[model samples]
Every structure is written in structure tokens, then in C-alpha cells.
Target: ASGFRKMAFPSGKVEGCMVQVTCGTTTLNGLWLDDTVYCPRHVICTAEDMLNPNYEDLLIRKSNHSFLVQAGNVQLRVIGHSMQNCLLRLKVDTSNPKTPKYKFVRIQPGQTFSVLACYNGSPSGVYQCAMRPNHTIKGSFLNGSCGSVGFNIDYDCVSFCYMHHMELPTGVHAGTDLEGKFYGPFVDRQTAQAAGTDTTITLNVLAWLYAAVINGDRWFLNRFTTTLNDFNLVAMKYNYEPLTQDHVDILGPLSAQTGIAVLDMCAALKELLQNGMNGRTILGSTILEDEFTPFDVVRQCS
Candidate 1:
């Protein structure tokens, strides 16, 4: 599972966290880039499955399930197919005997679930894994006719889709992974003000352009050369002037700008669009090569 570590942006920095290009699957942990969408995976399943259970029939439904995840932290899921909401729990290690009171859990795939068993301060032998024998409350909980049985553990649970979201007219878009510090690096204008920060990036080439292109991609994000107006979608949210040639300078060298001019961002992202959505390279370099420790952004940072 993927463990989401709330990005502790420096004193005043906020990166764009929106779903630009989104495509998930039945099996995967998913991916996140600068809090935006980067071919991120998803957990796909029916509504009443173990991942998102909700069977009205209590005893007859063996819907209650448990498994071994990890031991430090985890993200639980209970709805939205993985849309990120208060659908599940946020738990860490298991405390003492689950014999008295236990906890129930179900997490998303990419969002890992850290579970600490008794292997702690003093080996109590009775852990909180909820594996075969040590995981459940009632015996012979193999099927439904067996009545109501629960799998409990000891831990603190908190639930919520941690991604900072934006409810613009366009729809829902994340602005940051967790929270942020205003005006640092990628912090955009609206994100700053809305987040109650003192700083903001008046020039949000990446944020606006990213949202426009990718959202269009969801439908038909043709070429910016043709669909430049779509860029206004996220731009309006920033409450700043629209894009211009000068803002192009922020993406990368003249090449990327030229790419934006002719094709779009990085020639309209050859690999991502020209080739297909299944690509790791943007422009000439892979995301790993994209840099942004401070200043602006690159393939990676963007």
C-alpha cells in the first residue's frame, strides 16, 4: 500500500494537488506527483467488497475481514472506490490485548496500512495483527451462518482524504497533498489565500496549464495551440491574470516553451499524448530528471 506522508512544505510553499490526468485500475497502489495526477493507480472493486463493505445483514454477511498490513501508519478506505474521503480509518500500531476492545480496519491499496503487533515495548505474545488465529474475536468465523464475529485491535483511528481539495466550478481538484506554507515554491495564488497563507505564486503556469491540459485529456485535451482557452479553467481559480509568453519561461528552457507554442507543454507532452497516457518521460527527460528543490519546477517538480 502507498503511505501518504503529509508534505510538510517549508515556511511558505504550496504545490498544485489536482487530478489532471487520472486513470486507475483494479490492481495498484497508484502514483502522485507534486500532489497532481501522474498515472496514479487506484483500487477498483464493487461497493460491498471487503475494501468498501456495507452489508445491512450483520450476522449473515461475513463482510468483516482483516489482514496484516504494516506497523507504523496506514490509509483505510470505505467508499468512493478510492476517491479519498472520511470512508475509513487512520490507524498505527496495536496496543495491548485486543481481548477487551478491538478496532476494525480496511484501507486503500496505494495507501498503506501500518499495523504493529505485540512485538513492541515488551513481547506480550498477543499481538494486534488480526491474522488467522490472533486476528479475529469469535471462533469458526469462516462463514456467515456462524453469526456476528468481529476482528478488533488496539490503535487510534482517524479518517479523511488528506489531499487538500478545491471545489471550483469545474469540479473537485486537490491543491496540496495535506496542507502547506504559503508562497514557497509551487504555491499558487488561490491555494495561498484559500489555505490562509500569506504568500502566493502570481505566476502559476504549472497549476493552470496542468489542470487544463490533463482535465481536457480526460475528455479530449487536444493541443494547447488549439485549446489554450481551456487553460483558463484553473487560471480563473488562481484569481490572477491569464497565461502569457512570459509565464512560459517558468516551465523549462526555450525548448519547452517552443514545445508549448507549437504542440503544448513539452510539445504537448509527446509521450503522454502523442504516444499515449502510459509514459514516464516528458519532453526529453523522465520525471526523475525533473528538478525543483526550491525555485521553479521541471518535468519532475511539475
Candidate 2:
């Protein structure tokens, strides 16, 4: 199935999105990250694949059948074990005589289906998955218990296996979960770009690195490292060219040419924080007494 989606961040920057890494072929258009061999076996296919009339993939066979339902923004699924061909309806807000919505479908035994109900609003209440009381269209409803009831509310729903379909090939590596500026301390890159001075930025970066290492928060650590690397690149702009020179002073006193080395040192700090220093300290070595001697750079603002 074709995997791709456009994602918008809070910075008002609508960019392409994709998974971090996948074992799929990369092409100019995009990475075909879906595993063709295992997808069919697992009943895993994109919504597009299911919608395609000409697509001849056995997505719903006797052995495996699956379906998707849309409730507000939440997507629910129903998988059949030993079901039979019966009329099923999703009952929502039965108290509302005029405004209630009901999705009806005829599904076979040993088959799963989800396209019976769809609504556009916040989800609420336990939906009644009922079957037809009789064999015909004018039959009463028999409440069944074999369908998704209270679906947890979420803004969007994408299957875990097909999550890579939303990914795009950006130069930045994927790890930390930051959509726009919702994750970091700053609200947007523009504000962050305008706020940092060399001294304050260096101090905050080191502080966050130490805190993250102590707390085992690799997410915060990675983001802080990225911010620090940006500052280091700015400091080295005139002194060096793009990847042509080395030993350009990074973080002023640190004097590292490559950002990788600085990030590596921060990575090592995690181990140091986890393991005791020289088998002496109670928990781990003090940042002040470490071999790296992380000094505060009190240089004037550029």
C-alpha cells in the first residue's frame, strides 16, 4: 500500500511526516516501508488498499477478516472469531430520537468488519453493537456484545503497523516526540531563536543534559543536544566551512569541531550518571568533579 501523509506542526509549518526507520526500499517519491510479505499474513493493509477496487490483495479471507469503524475522531475495529452472516448495526445516542445515528451492515461468519458506523464529533457513551432480531430488514434489534464499546478518545487513529505510511524523508533523524513546539520549553523555533544568548544557552543546555542524564529522559536530552548543536554551528560559521574543517570551538571552552563529539559526551554522561564513579560515590560522580570539567562560558553576546 502507498504510505504517506501530510502533518502540520504548531509552528504553522505544515511538513511531510513519516516513521523514524523501516526496512523498506527508498525511492525518489518516498520509502515503500510496508513489509509485503508479513502484511497480508497479519491482515494488515492501509485504508487506501482496502478502498481500491482493482487492488487484488486477500485482505479479508476466511482465516482472517478485519474491519474499521469511525466514531468521532476515534477509529475502532471489530474482528470475528466464529461469527456468522448477520445484520449488525452500531447504535449511538439512542435517547436522541431524532438525532441518533445508526450504522447497519451484513457481515459473514468468521469475518471482521468496521465500516458500519462513522461520525464527526467527540466520542461518548458505550455504542450498542446489535444484531437483527429476525432474518429480514423489518426485524427488531438484538444487542450483541462482540464489538468495540467505549473507544478511548483520541484526535487521530492510525494502526501501529501502518504508521510508517505517514512518514516523510526529512534530513533530521526521528526519536524525540515533538510536534511543532508542544514538547520543548519554547513554544516555537522563532521565539527560541530570538531568546538564546551564548552564555545562557550554554548553561541551560548543560543543565538540561545533567538533569536528563540523571532522570534517564533521553527525549529531553536529545532535544537539548539539538538546540546546543545549532548554537555551536552558529559559533563556527565564520571560522569553518560546511564539514570541511575540524576543531572549531563548540560550546566555547569545550573546543570540539564536530557536534557529534559534543553529543557523544552528553551520551556518555548518562552512563556516568547510571554507574558509580570509581566505585566510590553513593549514586554516581558529581558533574562538578567529573573528568570533562564542564566549565561555564561567560563570553559576551555576539
Candidate 3:
């Protein structure tokens, strides 16, 4: 059926979502990758011979009572499965009341089943998979399963065989358990750009790498690195420090030629202090350690 929040479908419905990977000739909008053969077969049953076989073989039917069905929007066709008592169970995220929880269904096996449910956010909260209830085992949901519930998005209009399958849809990858950015220190490229203003190391690296276009005094980066490293080694006993000053004598001409500003370097340093290496040693003496903590509102000035 359909829902807008978690647990909305306490009773079974026709719609549910499941996630699985296939290793076969799967294509989408003309783009293809990897190989998943049984992806379709396990999810939706398809017969052989009807696959990429010869004309005579294609005409042969594996079973007269084969079925095709749809779960959610995904479609699948199956062979030799009875629909009389077949049940389609789904696990949905029920953590937030506003978000739709997973659901289950009892379809008329041969009938193409369809499902639709609420997607809270991204189910990538680093704690999503742990909170979801188990689909096969009733009342056995993880504490913070990140929308790990599965349902048939669609069933066959396509044929399935022992050697056929497909990768998950865009957001429905089977290896989603390790995808949330919250638990890691991985900032996307967009966020990294915004952060470049204050972190001298990151800024300098970018500036130096693009020096031909930037044409600034890269000596400042070297000086900053030298000073920062010296401080750590002698003062804090931390190895591998960032840069700390502008090398005017060595890079004076280069700075003039490239329009690199000493102030901009300072600005980058200040920004880095705010977010990178200026304050806490709790994570480490290194800059940009690999971890993600919730943003602290108090630390933000702008």
C-alpha cells in the first residue's frame, strides 16, 4: 500500500521495500557497471531458456505456473512459486514517529505487488541500520537501524535466470550499512570548499596545486609548514605540523607576480584554527582527523 510515517502500516499492505544486489547484465538509462546475475532471480523469479537463448529454447517454458510481480516500483517475474500462501514482509524505519516505518504484505503470489513508504531522511545517520526492526524476525529490530528494511520495489516485466541480476537503485545500495558520513571525517567537496577559508594547510595546498592560475607566493605555505612543524616538534612534541609564516625573502617576487596576499594566508590560518588545528587536542595534534562529531552551535561565530 502506502504510508507517510514509520509504523503507518502496522497491518500488511501491497507495498513494501526490499534491498538486494544483483550480479548480471543490469542497465539503467544506458549506463551499466559490474555484474549481477542472480539479482533478479532471488528477488523475483525468472526462468531460463526464456533468457538470451535460441528461438526454440526461448519458446520452451520452464513452468506454466510462473508469476510476475512488483514491489514498490521495481518489477520482477518468477517461476515455479505458489502464491496461495506466499507473504511479502518488509522492514521499515520506525525510529521517528514522523518517518514511515517498514511494512509487510501477503500478495496473491502471481499478482504484481507494489509498495510505497516514507523515507525519513537518508537513513545514513551512522546509527540507522542499528535501529530498524528485522523483517524476517518479528520484534527483532535493531536499536538504530538506518532504514534497513527491504521490500520488492518492482517485479518482472524482465526475465530472470540462474545467471542474471541487477545492482540496487541509486539510493538503495546493499552495502548501505557503511555509508553514513556522520561517523566519519569525510566532508564532501562542497563543504570542503567552504572550510578552505580558515584552514591554512588545506588552503595552501589547494593554492599551491593551482599555483599556475593563482600565481601567489607559495613560500608562505612552506613557512607556515616549517613554523607549525617546528612548534609541534619542539613545543608540543607532536610530529608533522602545518606551516606558520610568510617567506617574504624567498617568495617576494613570486608573491608580487601571483597576487598572493599575506593576509589571505592569515585568514586561512584563522579559519583553520576555528575548525581545524587551533583548539582542541582531544582528537589529535593532526589536522582533519578522520571522524565526525555533531556540530557545536557555540563554536560558530557566523
Per residue, candidate 2 scores C-alpha lDDT tens digits across 1-302 of: 12111111121000011101111121111101111011111123243433432222332342212333223233323233221111112121212212212222222111111111111121112221111111111111122111111111112322111100111122111011111111112221112122111121222234324333333333322332323354446434422112211212333343232233455544443344444344433113233221111221111110
Q: For candidate 3, report its TM-score.
A: 0.20
For candidate 3, give the lDDT of residue 99. Answer: 20
Which segments of candidate 1 are over 4 A away from where they belong?
Answer: 1-65, 71-87, 94-302
Question: For model 1, how does the per-residue alpha-carbon lDDT over 146-195 read when each residue is reduced to its tens digit?
Answer: 10111221233222112211222232122222222111122222333221
RMSD of 1: 19.5
Report the lDDT of model 1 for residue 288: 18
Candidate achieving higher lDDT, 2 or 3: 3
Candidate 2: worst-modelled 10 consecutive residues by lDDT: 11-20
lDDT of each: 0.24, 0.22, 0.23
Local accuracy of candidate 3 as per-residue lDDT tens digits, 259-288 = 555444434343444356444432122443
- Give the Å shift of residue 167 in candidate 2: 20
